Amino acid sequence: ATPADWRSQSIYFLLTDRFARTDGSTTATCNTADQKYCGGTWQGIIDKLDYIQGMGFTAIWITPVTAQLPQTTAYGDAYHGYWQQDIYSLNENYGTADDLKALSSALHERGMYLMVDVVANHMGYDGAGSSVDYSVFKPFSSQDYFHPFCFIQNYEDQTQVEDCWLGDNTVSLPDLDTTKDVVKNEWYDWVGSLVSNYSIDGLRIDTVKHVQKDFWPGYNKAAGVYCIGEVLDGDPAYTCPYQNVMDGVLNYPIYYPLLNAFKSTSGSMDDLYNMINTVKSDCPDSTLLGTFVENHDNPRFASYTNDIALAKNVAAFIILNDGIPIIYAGQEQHYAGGNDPANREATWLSGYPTDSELYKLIASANAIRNYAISKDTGFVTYKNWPIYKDDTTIAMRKGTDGSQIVTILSNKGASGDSYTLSLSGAGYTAGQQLTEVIGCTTVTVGSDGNVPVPMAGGLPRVLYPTEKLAGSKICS
Ligand SMILES: *[C@@H]1O[C@H](CO)[C@@H](O)[C@H](O)[C@H]1NC(C)=O
Numbered sequence: 001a002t003p004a005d006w007r008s009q010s011i012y013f014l015l016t017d018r019f020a021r022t023d024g025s026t027t028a029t030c031n032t033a034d035q036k037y038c039g040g041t042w043q044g045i046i047d048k049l050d051y052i053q054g055m056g057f058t059a060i061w062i063t064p065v066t067a068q069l070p071q072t073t074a075y076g077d078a079y080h081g082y083w084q085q086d087i088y089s090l091n092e093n094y095g096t097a098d099d100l101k102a103l104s105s106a107l108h109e110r111g112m113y114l115m116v117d118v119v120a121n122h123m124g125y126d127g128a129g130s131s132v133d134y135s136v137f138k139p140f141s142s143q144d145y146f147h148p149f150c151f152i153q154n155y156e157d158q159t160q161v162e163d164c165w166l167g168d169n170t171v172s173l174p175d176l177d178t179t180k181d182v183v184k185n186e187w188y189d190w191v192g193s194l195v196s197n198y199s200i201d202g203l204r205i206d207t208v209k210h211v212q213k214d215f216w217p218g219y220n221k222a223a224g225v226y227c228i229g230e231v232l233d234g235d236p237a238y239t240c241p242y243q244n245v246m247d248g249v250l251n252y253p254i255y256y257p258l259l260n261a262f263k264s265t266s267g268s269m270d271d272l273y274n275m276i277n278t279v280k281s282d283c284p285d286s287t288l289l290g291t292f293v294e295n296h297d298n299p300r301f302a303s304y305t306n307d308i309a310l311a312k313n314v315a316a317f318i319i320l321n322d323g324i325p326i327i328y329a330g331q332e333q334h335y336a337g338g339n340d341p342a343n344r345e346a347t348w349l350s351g352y353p354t355d356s357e358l359y360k361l362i363a364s365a366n367a368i369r370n371y372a373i374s375k376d377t378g379f380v381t382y383k384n385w386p387i388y389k390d391d392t393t394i395a396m397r398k399g400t401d402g403s404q405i406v407t408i409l410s411n412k413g414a415s416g417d418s419y420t421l422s423l424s425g426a427g428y429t430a431g432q433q434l435t436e437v438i439g440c441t442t443v444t445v446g447s448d449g450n451v452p453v454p455m456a457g458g459l460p461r462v463l464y465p466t467e468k469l470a471g472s473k474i475c476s
């Protein structure tokens with residue numbers, strides 16, 4: 001599916017080993033500190049598609065599918081998929097090629113997309129970089145395919161960032177020489193044939209900043225689908241330029257101020273407001289970035305704060321911001337693991353309740369986004385406009401005049417006082433009826449064009465014209 005196809009999507013990102021087992025167990029041991037395979041599979045995902053689609057997601061992103069180093073390393077098993085050795089075999093832990101095709105087919109049958117995580121930067125190897133036997137890599141079964149062994153000493157030297165090896169002498173990450181035509185042609189042939197064989201709709205490309213920029217356009221073209229890159233840098237001046245060599249990047253620029261705004265009742269609404277405007281103006285296309293606050297490479301939101309209202313606001317922002325919402329499996333069950341490996345909790349241990357606070361908030365926010373997009377072909381290309389901030393509030397508008405969603409977020413948290421926000425800049429007409437679609441109440445725009453938004457419990461508010469909901473299932 002194309003970048004234009006992907007603008008309307010909403011992604012549930014999951015770790016294949018940690019989402020769902022073939023047997024459907026909700027009690028099977030998964031001690032994150034063990035760093036071992038817990039037994040999640042592609043067939044498990046299929047079994048739990050009702051749970052995902054119930055939150056209004058239109059797509060999933062699964063961790064990589066390639067065969068991994070076989071060892072239990074000092075850092076555990078390759079349960080996460082980022083230590084590949086044989087790119088022409090699947091990781092048999094998750095199932096067979098027929099299971100991965102069944103997953104693709106099962107999503108397509110529900111009108112959903114499959115995104116697959118891929119790494120071009122490196123292979124994985126158990127032990128020191130000086131110990132690597134290159135014959136274990138397929139097809140790259142020679143040291144000739146690899147950069148000379150060195151570690152990044154200076155993260156400000158982009159040549160070192162690209163040409164030296166990630167990892168360490170515990171688990172080494174042999175760095176492919178992606179400047180060689182032989183390595184480009186291998187990878188390009190591979191990714192086109194992966195996408196074709198499994199009917200994949202999009203890719204998440206990990207590790208993008210560690211591969212020189214001139215590699216990426218031919219890879220993205222060979223894939224023939226929307227590719228969203230991981231460029232792990234909060235500076236839009238570093239990260240944004242990568243969207244000129246690949247369709248999208250993950251929104252690490254928004255990540256930091258978004259986390260900081262909502263993780264604390266003292267979080268900066270200014271830094272978030274300013275980064276929204278910086279990305280909107282400066283990044284090649286904010287509507288093709290991936291919005292997130294939680295993944296397997298950072299502490300979970302609830303590891304910073306267990307305040308449920310703060311979690312509800314940050315989830316509402318992710319769904320209603322420019323670009324593709326991305327929620328990480330467990331975020332909807334308020335998982336609180338810190339850094340790796342604590343943030344790779346098994347989703348099944350929650351028992352997959354569909355009546356949890358954040359399951360319902362995500363379902364409501366995805367419902368209004370999916371509905372608004374179905375009625376407004378301009379929603380996805382209207383760049384989100386921050387219209388208001390104060391010390392505890394940000395309000396934003398997205399969508400064609402007459403059809404705009406106006407979202408008011410707060411960091412007051414669950415002990416926030418009851419009060420009325422007189423919101424200007426919404427652009428609704430005096431006297432129009434709005435539905436607050438989270439709480440399913442009505443608000444009427446003033447004669448003066450200001451919106452009197454009831455604020456309570458630090459809860460997010462999401463406004464949309466009542467007449468435009470006619471015949472919809474929203475707030476039945
Ligand atoms: C896709 O299937 C074709 C036909 O067998 C094969 O040549 C190719 O290597 C496969 N690609 C992947 C990555 O499975």
Ligand SMILES: [Ca+2]
Pocket residue numbers: 121161162163164175176210211
């Ligand atoms: Ca590299």
